[PDB]
Symmetry: C5
Subunit: 266 residues, 5 copies
């Protein structure tokens, strides 16, 4: 994390940068960035996934410099997030087809990472707000995860009881939660899910691409209590081991966020 | 002057028992066209809701919408057939349909059938007195989407010759191995204004939302297959217009 | 072509013409044969999808004259959700599985003009012996497998011009606008969109749309959605109807 | 040096043509196809037959004669599409059944669609899969290639100056040249690649560069070039042949003043 | 440097064809990698040097232009992959798709990347397997840990040597590269079709949001690339990366700066 006062004064611009690590499970000390091997074919009535098999959302709160020296003034200053540049880091590491992966056929190279993937990021001045949805409401989730409380069959579609803040890194399983479009007035989020056994990962990098965070009235997220929130999930696909077992692979996400000072009423 | 309303519309995939809400009954295959009698719980239907408004007319101006719970398909540990020996479960994939409508009147639909001789089960509303022409265009088959969980998706499409007071959007992608591709963002808005700058006008102080979101097929360990659907969120901005 | 002068709307649903092998299978073709030698390729009539077309008469408005000018079209394929019936007739994807979706080669095409669509003949196999009731390239040669300029036709009859023999002619059609997409392959997914919010403008670079020459408006289409695979393994083309809503205006022209 | 566009009577013209594909044409009945594909030749003994090799198509269109000593014809737009795309809906003839009782296999697999419009012949750069390929009489291929010819060897410069002679697998348009040509190509490779081809008489490609100047036709000649390999046709035996289709061009030109 | 106005008056272009560095296992297999190994345990993963594609780079020298000084500024780049049609050779080396069929197209995982800057490309290391033992002649992350499989900020490198930095080890660094523009797309998968476009009508603008392009502060311009097109499958079943050269044409102008 770096917080840089690029310019000071009324038109002050501060740039925050950070690399958010993925939280795929990390089943042992040497497989950081991967999940535990996937189980299959568990009956809905006895589906008890292991902690390290479940990728979770990544998140961090980044403290910003205090702007208000007199807290009793009629007008106070807040940091306002105006743009974000972001990309997934280490995509070329998937070109290692010599280590660990099942050969595609006899005498062939290793099988590329492929299959279902999810790429998501958010930037806001409050924690990202999430809605819970489950494949199977009777899944017994493991200690260390935070998942929908008292789920019912309705939790497999929409159960409005399942509201949460993404307020803990490596705790909210990606399979249980989505960003909540009925809330998040102070966050911009973006995600794409692509499902399937053989789905090719497609990932772009460039330092020339910027996303604008301003709403239709020209206001970006406002950093409450001088806190900027970054969230991500970048499940790149499934790594298939020589044995045939499969593990999720994730990669870190870079953020560069440009902020300006907005005057608001107390 | 301006008001916003929102709704989470649940999918109606069939719901074969109390536990399998959001899924259909397992799919039958290979019925002859002359003896095709599908069970009610096997047929996804269109979802719809009528949203009352404060009582000039309310004009629908924009809609924000997205499919809810897409990441739930990352549960590959529960119920699904292994992709190979020692491998994880098979992702939901295959034919899918994503559709929504916003209107001041119920959605107007036209009936088209794969097989006109299909015997549809009690509880569904399907084209009446179908003929072979019902497999192409039979203009007799007009309906209003006036009941939730009743009009099967396979029997009905939005009618482009009507719907003067509704805007609708859908995409059908067919095939066994088709990957679901779903995007979420709170930064996308669809403007509902026509070329004259006029949106859907809510006739009896009612706003109509409609959806179908069949995400693909879930393959059980045994090889059987079931539709999986997801709820759809709507946030509609309305303004008052005099008439 | 002088000033614009007033406004009328026509709409039509054009049925597909996939072959219709019996009275129950409207919208399908006869099952496909395979592996006919080029020297003995005699397709049956009901196996061959043809272009759909209709002529829509308009009011007769007549030194100068007035003509109906086509300005915009809204069009879409009708019944796309019918392909979610995987219980009827289709081969199971595997044991205990649902039926196989319609998929594979598809062609989606429409045209709007004030003359019949002008077409160019091109054939896979020039030696194909086409059946009675079809209108195909006359006196074809090896060159008819590439470009043979002899093969000019008007789409002047419904359910007669096989889709496999004919394409819209880009060297002609001055008074028609046409649009088509061919996607080929064994397992290609059908992808079809619907919305009543999309309009195709028919005006050319000078703001002039198709002009209905003898008070007739022409619509044409082909919407082969893919192949339907029966339990036996036999395959049939499946097609769907196309809707047209065309807005016209009155235009002054010199005689 | 380019001056003002010239307007007036006869300052505009339009030309059109159809360019036939050059896929090999293995016998008198198989126009538009290649000879069946061989496979698995060692790089040291790779001798493709003439009729197995698709070649670029090209033609020169004469324009109304302007005095070369000052005006030149300037190509402004081109309308172009592939002709006969629906012919691939013939699945009854020649093609291997997809399975027992099934229809024939569609044409699919690797494909290349390319066109160019210019006031000079298209300038090409040679690149080879295998520098040791022994090309047959009747083809013009990179001369005296080396191992470097499998990547970039700048000796391999050629003009597309002969129809049905330059194999598509040996040559690409040269981005370091072609100051007076606009070219456009897409290669898609793979066994099962679906052909995707659009037609419409409403789409135009503008040939003007960033200064608003199109190709200038040197001696009242317009050069058109194309390659449209649509995929592989699979015979019932399992053998495979390239299938190609003709391309139509309609080019609009204007007179431009020069010095 | 404080950037002042563009120096106007009676702009230059430089160009380069940058060769791919796929490993080149012998004198005849320029542009390919060594055959790919598979299934090496993470604890004993020792790739041979000729199996590892590396980033390509070149330095283009420029003449010095000199209170206010002048520097060359890169405004636009035209770039494309060279030799894409070479993949239509399905007769040489590749395994037949089925009995009596043609050869298997190049397909599978591919990466296409370029950069243009006034300093060498700045890179960040990320590994599939931190315990990989890389071969002599490669430059790879130093003292990697488990954290090196996600983000380890210690792994910073300059692309300061051609055919040395393995593609699999390094990515352009978005936290640096203030004076370079880079662009890349990774497409992974066993059977991914290559899709490659060529046209001389496409230009990438290298100006930033203030209208300033990369500045050649030490009178040098840097081009960098990786173009792994896919995997070639030999008749034996073995697989090799295939790469192709990348063309660059960069338009430069003179920019005044404060000393
Ligand atoms: Cl909860
Ligand atoms: Cl009815
Ligand atoms: Cl004829
Ligand atoms: Cl040469
Ligand atoms: Cl390092």
């Amino acid at each position: 994390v770096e917080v840089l006062e690029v310019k000071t004064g009324v038109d002050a611009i501060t740039e925050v940068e950070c690399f958010l690590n993925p939280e795929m499970g990390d089943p042992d000390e040497n497989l950081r960035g991967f999940s535990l091997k996937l189980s299959a074919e568990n009956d809905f009535s006895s589906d008890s996934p292991e902690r390290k098999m479940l990728p979770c959302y990544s998140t961090a709160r980044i403290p910003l410099p205090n702007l208000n020296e007199d807290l009793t003034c009629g007008n106070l200053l807040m940091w306002e997030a105006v743009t974000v540049q972001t990309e997934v880091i280490g995509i070329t590491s998937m070109l290692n087809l010599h280590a660990g992966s099942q050969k595609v056929h006899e005498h062939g190279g290793g099988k590329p990472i492929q299959g279902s993937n999810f790429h998501f990021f958010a930037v806001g001045g409050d924690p990202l707000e999430m809605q819970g949805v489950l494949m199977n409401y009777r899944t017994k989730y493991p200690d260390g995860t935070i998942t929908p409380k008292n789920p019912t069959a309705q939790s497999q579609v929409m159960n409005t009881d399942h509201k949460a803040y993404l307020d803990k890194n490596n705790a909210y399983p990606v399979e249980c939660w989505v960003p909540d479009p009925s809330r998040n007035e102070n966050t911009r989020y973006f995600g794409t899910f692509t499902g399937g056994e053989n789905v090719p990962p497609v990932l772009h990098v460039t330092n020339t691409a910027t996303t604008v965070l301003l709403d239709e009235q020209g206001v970006g997220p406002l950093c409450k209590a001088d806190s900027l929130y970054v969230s991500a999930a970048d499940i790149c696909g499934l790594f298939t081991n020589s044995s045939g077992t499969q593990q999720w692979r994730g990669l870190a996400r870079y953020f560069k966020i440009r902020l300006r000072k907005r005057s608001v009423k107390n």
